[PDB]
Each structure stands twice: as C-alpha cells, then as structure tokens.
Design a protein around this nucleic acid. Structure first.
Ligand SMILES: [Mg+2]
Ligand SMILES: [Mg+2]
Length: 398
DNA sequence: GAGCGGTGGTTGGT
DNA sequence: ACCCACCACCGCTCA
C-alpha cells in the first residue's frame, strides 16, 4: 500500500540528507527537525551480521550519522489504537527524543509536521501524505556504501503534478483499491480506475461530506457503468461495489487519525528539540554491555566512531575555538553531499570525547591522541569555529 | 515495502 | 469464436 503509487506520483527526488540539513540550517538559521518512524528499521537493520546485537549496532551507527548531519530527530513509536527498551535507552544516551504515538506512528509523524513540531517526516512510504504530511522522505540508503541519501516526496508538487493526487485523491484511491487492508473496498478496482476517479473529483467531494453520501455513490457508480462524462478509459459494468461503501469509518481513520492530544503537542513545542549533551559515560557503559566493546580496545573504538559526531553537535550548540578544531587543510564540494561545501578539519578524538583509554584494562594502529581528520559542512563550521574559518580563508587568499 | 513476470479477467473491437 | 491492451492480483525476491 499503496501498490503502484510511484508509477502515478513519481518515484521522488533522490537528495543528499546532508544537503537537506544544511540548506534548512542556512534558510531557517537552526537545525532541521526530523520525525523518524521507528518502523523503518526492521527491514534495513536485520542484515547486519557478526558481533553482539548487530541490529542495534547499526542503529548506533545511524545515530552517529545523525550527529554529524546536525539533525534534531524525534523518533516515533507506534501505540495501541489502530528491542524498544534498548532503543529508547540508546535514543536518550545520544540526547535524542523518543515519542510514543497514541496510534499509528505514521499518522503521528505527519501530524507533528503539520503542527510545526518537525520540518519533514522520514517513514517507510508515502502513507504519511494521506495523513497530512507535506515533505515526506523514505529509503535512507546508499546512492553500496554509506547511507547518504533519501527519496523526497512533496505533497505540493504531487497534487499539482501529472497525477493530480492530493490527500483526498489518494484517500479515495485507498478506499476504492485498498481491498487488502481496508474493509469494504471495491474488488477488481485497482490504482488505475481509482486514480481517474480521484481526478474526476470524487475525492474532493467525499472528503467534504458529513459522515447524503447516497447522491455521490449513485453518481459515481453510474459514471462508472456508463462513463457518460468519459471519466475513465473504459466502462466498468461489472465492478460490484459493496453496499457498505464508502466505509466512512475507514474515511475517518485517514481524515481524523488518532494522534496526540492538543496538550501533548504543546508539551512538545516547549520540550523539543530537547537538550542533547551526549552521555559519553553512558554510551561507554552501553557499548561495553551490548556490543562487547570491552576494555581499552572498546573504549578506543567508541572514541574513533563518536568523535566526528560530537564535533558537529558541539559546533551547533556553540579562543575556546581551538578546543574543538585544530586546523583546516582543504575544501571540496563532493557529489555525495550534492555539492555541499565541506572543510577538512583536524581534531584530537580522545580530547574531544572526554574518555581516557588508560582507565581501562589494556589487553599501523589508531591513536586517539594523534590528530584525526573529518569532512564537516562549511556552514556548520562558520557557526561553531568562526575565526578558524576566517584564518583559513585568509591563508587561502595568500 | 517495492519491483517483476505470470496470469486470469474485462473491455472493446476483429 | 478470437485477438488485444490494459489491468489487478499473485508469487517471488530483495528487504
Ligand atoms: Mg506508514
Ligand atoms: Mg504504511
């Protein structure tokens, strides 16, 4: 669901997540806020093999990636109207927000975006659009290397594009063609004639009706058996429309989905994005117990992986400049960021992270005390370490 | 969830 | 009777 939708609305725009984050940071002078439907993990994550808890090792690595993009994420969990404990623990340890939707997470993500709690939705598909989403993203994946890209769909362009499908058009598409996950849906009716029904206006109409409907179903089911207005390709005098159609309860579930109370939205308005302050000692205990990153090798490995992320996180909360960045050596506009300008920065991983390997039993190599290098987006560096970027730019004009 | 070929059915037209 | 294009649906396969 909805099967074959992308043939209608398009497959969407592939775009560097770093480009979305940095464009938004430049346009709105604050980091991108993302609602992430926690259901997107189940498929991608079950492929990591080896070690201890690989499904949530890779969740760990995606959280470090979100640290370095400078994205403020709210992770949304499904509720009962229609391991998560480690995960909610790991969310907290990274200073991210966990939110339990009352019902479907997709409906709640979309609601958080139209209330302004978040700027975009990352979900598994475009169901979010029937639920009111405007900017919806899916398929955070390589473009087979690191996951750098998402597929962007825009409700404003879709609705005025070739399909013409808007929220009520789609919604009629799922009422007519969704016979396999919604009751009282027209057998033998698929995406093609549901979509030319939507285009003929029957979705705007049904949606603007008090849950009367009889002067619509008869009007529709006659336009189908005869095609008098030529609203479709062929006649359909054999589509048996069930008497309990349109199931308006199924309509209510899309038009008025079960979302958080008004008071909960106001709570989120004051509390998200909440304070980050990555729990360094908490992540050290977590990785020791869950990944078996034991003793000094496991402390040194946490440092290598976490250090570039804290650099970014600390640059967005922000003389004291030298404490995060020792130098800049180059610039690039690499295609993996859709040409976001990045600066090559030096830093001391163990100095930046705050843990000490020698307080752990010792059991070519990587020294957390020597300088490491990372590519960081130039506009994040102008915010956090501004006079270092001047001197490099003055050095460059020399 | 999403893509793909097979397939069995409907429509409209030989 | 039969062809044909279109389509919905299904099993399969990557998840
Ligand atoms: Mg969904
Ligand atoms: Mg869905």
């Amino acid at each position: 669901g909805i099967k074959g939708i992308y043939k209608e609305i398009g497959s969407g725009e592939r775009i560097s997540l770093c480009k979305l984050a940095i464009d938004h940071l430049e346009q709105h002078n604050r980091p991108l806020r993302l609602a992430i439907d926690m259901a997107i993990w189940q498929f991608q994550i079950q492929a990591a093999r080896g070690g201890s808890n690989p499904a949530i090792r890779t969740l760990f690595y995606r959280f470090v990636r979100l640290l370095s993009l400078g994205i403020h994420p709210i992770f949304v969990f499904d509720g009962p109207n229609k391991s998560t404990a480690m995960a909610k623990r790991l969310i907290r340890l990274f200073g991210f927000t966990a939110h339990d939707a009352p019902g479907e997470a997709e409906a709640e993500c979309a609601y958080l975006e139209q209330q302004g709690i978040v700027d975009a939705v990352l979900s598994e598909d475009v169901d979010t659009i029937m639920f009111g989403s405007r900017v919806t993203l899916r398929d955070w994946s390589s473009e087979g290397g690191p996951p750098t890209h998402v597929t962007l769909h825009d409700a404003k362009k879709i609705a005025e594009g070739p399909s013409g499908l808007d929220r009520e058009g789609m919604v009629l598409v799922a009422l007519m063609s969704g016979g396999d996950y919604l009751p009282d849906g027209i057998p033998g009716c698929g995406i093609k004639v549901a979509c030319q029904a939507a285009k003929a206006g029957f979705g705007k109409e049904l949606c603007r009706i008090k849950r009367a409907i009889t002067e619509w179903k008869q009007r529709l089911l006659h336009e189908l058996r005869t095609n008098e207005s030529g609203f479709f390709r062929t006649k359909h005098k054999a589509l048996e429309i069930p008497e309990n159609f349109p199931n308006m309860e199924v309509l209510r579930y899309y038009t008025h989905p079960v979302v958080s109370s008004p008071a909960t939205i106001e709570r989120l308005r004051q509390e998200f994005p909440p304070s980050s302050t990555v729990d360094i000692a908490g992540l050290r205990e977590f990785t020791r117990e869950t990944f078996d990153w034991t003793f000094r090798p496991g402390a040194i490995k946490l440092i290598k992986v976490l250090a570039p992320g804290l650099l970014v996180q600390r640059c967005l909360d922000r003389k004291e400049e030298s404490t995060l960045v020792k130098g800049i050596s180059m610039r690039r506009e690499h295609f993996s960021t859709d040409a976001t300008p990045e600066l090559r920065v030096s830093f001391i991983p163990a100095e930046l992270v705050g843990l000490d390997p020698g307080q752990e039993p010792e059991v070519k190599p990587f020294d957390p005390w020597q300088p490491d290098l990372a590519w960081v987006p130039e506009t994040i560096l102008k915010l956090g370490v501004p006079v270092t970027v001047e001197d490099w730019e003055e050095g460059q004009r020399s």
